[PDB]
Symmetry: D3
Subunit: 301 residues, 6 copies
Amino acid sequence: SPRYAQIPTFMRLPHDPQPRGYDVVVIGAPYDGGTSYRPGARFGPQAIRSESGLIHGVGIDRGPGTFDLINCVDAGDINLTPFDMNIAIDTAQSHLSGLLKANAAFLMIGGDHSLTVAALRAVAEQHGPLAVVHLDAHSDTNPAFYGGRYHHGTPFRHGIDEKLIDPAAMVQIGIRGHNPKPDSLDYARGHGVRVVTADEFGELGVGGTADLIREKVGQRPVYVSVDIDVVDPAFAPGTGTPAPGGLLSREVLALLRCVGDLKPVGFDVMEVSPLYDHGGITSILATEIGAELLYQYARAH
Amino acid sequence: SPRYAQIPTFMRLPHDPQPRGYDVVVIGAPYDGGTSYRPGARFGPQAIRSESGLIHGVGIDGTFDLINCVDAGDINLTPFDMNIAIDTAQSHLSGLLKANAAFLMIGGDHSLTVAALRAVAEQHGPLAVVHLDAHSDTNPAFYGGRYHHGTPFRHGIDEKLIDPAAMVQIGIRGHLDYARGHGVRVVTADEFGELGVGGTADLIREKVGQRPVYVSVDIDVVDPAFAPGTGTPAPGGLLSREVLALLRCVGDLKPVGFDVMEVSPLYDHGGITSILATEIGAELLYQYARAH
Amino acid sequence: SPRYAQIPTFMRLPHDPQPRGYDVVVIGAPYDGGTSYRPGARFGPQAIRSESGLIHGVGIDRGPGTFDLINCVDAGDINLTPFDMNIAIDTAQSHLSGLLKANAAFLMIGGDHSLTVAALRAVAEQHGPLAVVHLDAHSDTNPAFYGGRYHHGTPFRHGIDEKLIDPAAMVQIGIRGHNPKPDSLDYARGHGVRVVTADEFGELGVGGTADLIREKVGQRPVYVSVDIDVVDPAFAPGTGTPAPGGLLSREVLALLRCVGDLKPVGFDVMEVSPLYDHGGITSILATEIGAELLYQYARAH
Amino acid sequence: SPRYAQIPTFMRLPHDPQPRGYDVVVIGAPYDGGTSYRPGARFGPQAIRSESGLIHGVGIDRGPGTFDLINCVDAGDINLTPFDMNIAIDTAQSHLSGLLKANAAFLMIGGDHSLTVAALRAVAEQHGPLAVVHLDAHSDTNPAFYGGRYHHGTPFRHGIDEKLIDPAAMVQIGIRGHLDYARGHGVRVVTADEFGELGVGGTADLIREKVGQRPVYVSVDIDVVDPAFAPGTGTPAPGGLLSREVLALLRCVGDLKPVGFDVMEVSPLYDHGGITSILATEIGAELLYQYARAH
Amino acid sequence: SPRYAQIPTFMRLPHDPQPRGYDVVVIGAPYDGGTSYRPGARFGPQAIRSESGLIHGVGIDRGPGTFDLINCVDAGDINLTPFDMNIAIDTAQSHLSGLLKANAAFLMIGGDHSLTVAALRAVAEQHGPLAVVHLDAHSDTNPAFYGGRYHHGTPFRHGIDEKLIDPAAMVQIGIRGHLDYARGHGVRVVTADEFGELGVGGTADLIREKVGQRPVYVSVDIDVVDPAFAPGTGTPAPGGLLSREVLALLRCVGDLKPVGFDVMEVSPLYDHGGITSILATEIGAELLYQYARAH
Amino acid sequence: SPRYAQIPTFMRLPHDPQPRGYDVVVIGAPYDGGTSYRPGARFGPQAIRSESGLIHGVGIDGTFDLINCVDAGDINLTPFDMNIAIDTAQSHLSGLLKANAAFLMIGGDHSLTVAALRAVAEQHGPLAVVHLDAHSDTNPAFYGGRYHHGTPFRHGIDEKLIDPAAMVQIGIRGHLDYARGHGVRVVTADEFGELGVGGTADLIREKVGQRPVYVSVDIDVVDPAFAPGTGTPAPGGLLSREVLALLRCVGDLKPVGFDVMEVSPLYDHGGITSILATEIGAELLYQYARAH
Ligand SMILES: [Mn+2]
Ligand SMILES: [Mn+2]
Ligand SMILES: [Mn+2]
Ligand SMILES: [Mn+2]
Ligand SMILES: [Mn+2]
Ligand SMILES: [Mn+2]
Ligand SMILES: [Mn+2]
Ligand SMILES: [Mn+2]
Ligand SMILES: [Mn+2]
Ligand SMILES: [Mn+2]
Ligand SMILES: [Mn+2]
Ligand SMILES: [Mn+2]
């Protein structure tokens, strides 16, 4: 059975739209109603699934494959309307909350970053205020707009504001541009969020940044949220707000190794907009990030 | 001055964001919040402008010598809220009509046409309509999706912006009682083939007569081969030359507004969809001059 | 549930990899081992599924939707090796034969045209020598090659040779170029096949060609095999051997209306190679062709 | 011997950079210095060659193949500078003239349409004032100006002005979009609209009447077909001909006395699926066949 | 007011086709007549403008925005003929000189690199022989020849030869692939290899030492970065710099006395996801910021 | 003569389909019958040739002045039968070596390297190997898939074409006992990062020494950002400059053959994969000159 054969699921996982008893459920969130610039992330889950067949959940020299250590399934997608932002967020919250009643955690494949507010609400409900590892070119702590409460530049502001996040245990890495509009990092920093700009990441290195994550997060339940635009546009052209001067794929993949030293309770990989991609490299990278997160969940638990 | 030089305006027209005294104002509506399938029409005005430099408003055997046109830039449409975006479009388009005769709106998804109909009916009363589309776009609204792109002509008829007895829609195919029951004349792609351009033009003239008419073109009326850059393509469509030839009949009508919607440039190839959209717009501007 | 949401099946049909009791099973054949020029048809089923969500099986003014008249399902794909032509053909034959033990018919989404030999073998086994309506820019009655018994230019030669086809009840429409290599139509014509070149089709028109199909086929069980390259490259750029000067999409779709006047017992839509496509228009057309065939099956039965 | 194997030559013809004694030499002209809008036709020959391996010079029910009737070769390209329009046009004429000293005729693969003036100069030197069949969305009879003598909208104005063309034996077909000079000189202009009325057959009859048996040069701008069929071109014009219409119309060439031809304005950067270059190959293939039929 | 709305200007700056009294005018130069390989840079300004709406002139932790420190405007484009290299270069110089009569400086968005000779001519007229920071995979100090005086490999040879540049204050960085003239004139060449050894910091130190406080022109060929980061360019050269390296290196400009700059060779037809044009915008944005910082 | 002019040969070299007396012959292997995922490498030689005109064999601070090279065209490889295609490649490559010193094979999928190894070992005995790849390609063959693209180095070791104690493979990542058990040195992408270019080059020199060495480059060794046009991309790969810098060490070795495989142009963007492949080939040719 060649890897491109059969209806595409994430990493060729079994499909079950009403999953019960799994460790990690992969759930798509095909929605881009929060996008402020280029849309198209509504196709992110479809494209990521299509390209994911390539990727095995077996590493190099890591012993047993992820899927022999933990039980995972592709639960299909949340039925998110493209016509109403507030309804989509509520729907996502309800669906994600549902998944946690009989499954340990989910990996949400987006979809624009606004959806993370729904995920944080679901996860925080089960675990209390959460530590956060956030990889992004943008802080995403901007204020809501008239008529846009949940644009894709707001999710971590809502997370802090609603106490879904313990900002003293939040680290965001890769920051180098403004999303929707210029807004200082004063809100984040004043709340105690540790911001690691792309510049600082260059100084710290993968190792130093990983140490910083372990120190800030400790063993608190942690949600790891990855905006694909964290990496340079060369590595992830298929995204709605590219920001030149970003991380290399290998830096992001190496950094995520530290997740297995934490207590991850949820994760997401957002903002893949496949129409802007080239050779599917963005969706392939998104898959690999997802795979690494799953493996690290296994290692951690 | 090569045609690609300078900041791109529609057909290299002058730009004036607050125009007054023009015959037709070209106005972009960069918004795709009504799209049900592929988004990207928010970039339609930019792409159309970018490709439009190629196109002269001089045919074979000059528009901008006959009438006064200008590119009024865009309506600032939020991508986050369909209700606010439609209201904003309505306000802006209505404002344009207070000071100028008519507009050509470059979309943007077809939902925006309700705003256009509202503005135009405010000036001319209930309107005749010539609607070119693969889809009827007379589907019901529902709570949470009041202005999806399949509703504009339903809203138009419901709100009495359209006189359905003077509305013809051409090109419908793929995958109608409401429309027909209201008196709308539907010309499927199949029927269009039987009637031909000339028979369809005769039908339009018969149905619309001299009534103030809004001509609304969904780029998806033509086969996906001619317009790949669109959100809901429908195979088995009209040839570009058929649509362009058909639109010559507009000069025999009394056009009071027009639009060219649903160009989604990310799906285009070689810019051909945006070039065709420009040519459609150009034809409409010329026919406005001929009519008036 | 927006049409791009959920794991993609053909026209959003239910999925069942072991279907029993359906009227028409949609089965993918992700294989391009028979391609002589550009490969990539192995991705045809995936791409066709992905773009098919757009298309409803409800026509305009046709009353009840296809799926309210007949029971259809997406059976997933045949696991076709990309490394061995003869094994792939045998595997396809066996799988397709299996489907007919508990289901009335299938719609095979290819995959290169070589696979049709397997389909003809399965269908002929159930119904005896078959009438054939073949839409293609190429006759596909070329001889096998050293090391290539089942290249994509051979299927109708094998069908005639093995008596899977009643050539006196076979019509091929759209012929205008040579595939793999130049070969006269003498073999086909000498066997009594009616060849309607693209030129002749222009003279006959859709209506005249449909009359010709009804006359030649009658009420014999008929297999309808569509090579996407029948239409001009403008309408189907995503294919392995384009041939300029082809039919319009609407001509092909109109012609296929005559299928409901026949006794169809199987069909396929082959040679979509999505890497060469633009805006997905080829896969969208392939979907619509499939939809029309399904509707016509319903009408006929 | 798969069609995509080997270094790409036009229709897998043999290559000879200094051909002598052939019937028709296929010569590339990789230059876009005359382009007024999108450039990229400099890559036309390369892309056409690459996609051409698909296409056999054997038709359906047409008998022996073209290459069994006439001896053809791919002569490579003319070394045309991208930096100087006047030098490129001069170089083109010299090279084309050279080919005609040793071979009966050439099929030039462009490259932008300005190059056709060089071809006309070379061909008229051998045959005298020429009849012309010109397929294009644009008339290409616009005036030259200082600094742009050879923009791509000039070749037929030069041809007429220099008496390389007998305008009373020139027909241009497909004109549309956005003509006194041409008409006043006796050129028959068939707009796309008029072509729709006349049909392929009526237009072919018209061509035969206008050209007669005068030596004729057939020049095809790929932009004559609708952008749907030829997206890869520099100045697309919506509302154009179908591929099948152009190919069928070109059958009339075998009833004429063709002495040269070209296929211009393919700009592969704007193409999709290589369909423009595949069509250009098929047009060239039809022209070669009709050359064999005529002679 | 979404970033993709309105007619596209560079970074959504106001437009004024006859700007007077500004600090820095952004001027497009839509011309690729100097290109030796792939054309298409004529569309550079249009594509850069279209993608630039994304990018704010506000940095991270950098304080007040660029446009709050300096007054900038998009001056539209120079009307450059695609048909004549010499006329285009002359036109460019005239237009750029005009801008300098009424505005402090300009940022030119190309267009192929040959245009830089016109910019250098205009800028040196105001400031005398210039220091130069040149980022490129290629030295662009190749000789001119008759018929191609201004191909895109010549601008810095002209600049040195005409004494528009003080070569003892010129540094070129990124050179690689496939130099006596430049070195013999005192130019400091930093190959991509040497850049790897020196690092961003070492190279910046070198620039500061070489340029000092002499008026300096900063010219960036987008092909300095690896093709992975800038695929949309005419002569890509594998093995190039990372985007982040170029952006970080350009921080040193605020320690200098910049009097002009440009960002050349974007050819959008070869771009993917618009990433080249987005990067070009960010480079321009950094140059404007460093101009404000310097002054 | 502009670099895009003339029929495309590798780096504008002369063409001779039956060469004799050359130092290195460039030979295309247009075949993708071993691909397990995306096909299209059958077009690798054509695309590489098309883009290669850009690249001069003159570095900074001239190859074709040092050694004599030629483009020998392609091997006529059937797309329909893997066993016949491998045998054909072997025969053709062996024929080239009877009359010329070495070849640079431009692929084509990596399965073809078994044929190359067979031909080269016939001239030099069991070979040292430097293999750059995201994948080890030492997977087992099976009936019906004897020469899939994940087998070439397994066949090489099994058939004694390779001395595994003198084989190093660099770049392995993603998703090895056979190889390690045979003495192969595997340098994962992670280890490569620790060692750097210089440490890896030292390791290669130590392992291979002066033994006749075949250098086989899978384009997928570099990150998909640098080489999108390939059949099995693996994120987190090497930068182009790292691969090019590493290959400088070949000039300190005794190279007897090389290849650049798995370019699949349909997935490329801006031709960057084919341009990189050309530069890799160019570097290898220069290092051949330096070594010999
Ligand atoms: Mn972001
Ligand atoms: Mn984000
Ligand atoms: Mn529609
Ligand atoms: Mn519509
Ligand atoms: Mn076919
Ligand atoms: Mn076929
Ligand atoms: Mn033309
Ligand atoms: Mn022309
Ligand atoms: Mn350069
Ligand atoms: Mn340069
Ligand atoms: Mn590999
Ligand atoms: Mn490999």
